[PDB]
């Protein structure tokens, strides 16, 4: 979708919370930070 700044990408799979696009979604999870997956 584009360049994402302020979130960390993890090699984990979860249900889509915040739809970013092209199969990437972000969420607020564990200290606490915004994670893209």
């Amino acid at each position: 979708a584009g360049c994402l700044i302020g979130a960390e990408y993890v090699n984990n799979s979860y249900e889509c919370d915040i739809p970013i696009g092209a199969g990437i979604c972000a969420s607020y999870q564990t200290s606490q930070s915004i994670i893209a997956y």
């Binding site: 979708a1 889509c16 739809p19 696009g21 092209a22 199969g23 979604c25």
Partner: protein, 46 residues
């Protein structure tokens, strides 16, 4: 050179949330459910 001209006029395209691979995975899962389980998987555990 056609998409670039539209983009230069502020006409962008948002990529779909579900990629083609995930849609293919959904179709494969539906095929597996309808082949190995019939209609039972559509109303509970396969």
């Amino acid at each position: 050179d056609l998409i670039c001209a539209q983009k230069f006029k502020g006409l962008t395209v948002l990529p779909p949330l579900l990629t083609d691979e995930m849609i293919a995975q959904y179709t494969s899962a539906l095929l597996a459910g309808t082949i190995t389980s019939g209609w039972t998987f559509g109303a509970g555990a396969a």
